[PDB]
C-alpha cells in the first residue's frame, strides 16, 4: 500500500518541481529582460543622475 | 480434599480450556481473515492508484 502510494505522489511531486521552476524560470527572464529593456531606454547615466 | 482438588481444578480447567479453544479459533479466524483483507485491501489499493 504504502511503497507503491509513497511513489505516487512522489514521482509526481519531482515533474511538478520542475514545473514549479520553470515557472519561476521564465518569469524571472521577463522580469529580467523587460528591467534590460528599460534600463537601456534611457542613457545608462540617466539612471546615474536620476540616482 | 482429594474430590475439593479433582473438582477444583477439573472446574477451572474446564472454563479455561474452553477459554483458550475458543480463542484458537478467533486466532486461525484472525490470520485466514487478515490474509483476506490482504487481497481485498489490496485490490482495492490498487486500482486507487491507477
Given at each position: 500500500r504504502v511503497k507503491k502510494v509513497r511513489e505516487m505522489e512522489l514521482i509526481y511531486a519531482r515533474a511538478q518541481l520542475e514545473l514549479e521552476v520553470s515557472k519561476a524560470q521564465q518569469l524571472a527572464n521577463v522580469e529580467a529582460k523587460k528591467f534590460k529593456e528599460m534600463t537601456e531606454?534611457?542613457?545608462?547615466?540617466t539612471i546615474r543622475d536620476l540616482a | 480434599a482429594m474430590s475439593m482438588a479433582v473438582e477444583s481444578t477439573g472446574n477451572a480447567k474446564a472454563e479455561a480450556e474452553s477459554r483458550a479453544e475458543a480463542a484458537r479459533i478467533e486466532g486461525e479466524g484472525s490470520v485466514l481473515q487478515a490474509k483476506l483483507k490482504a487481497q481485498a485491501l489490496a485490490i482495492e489499493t490498487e486500482a486507487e492508484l491507477e
Open positions: 531606454a534611457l542613457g545608462p547615466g | -
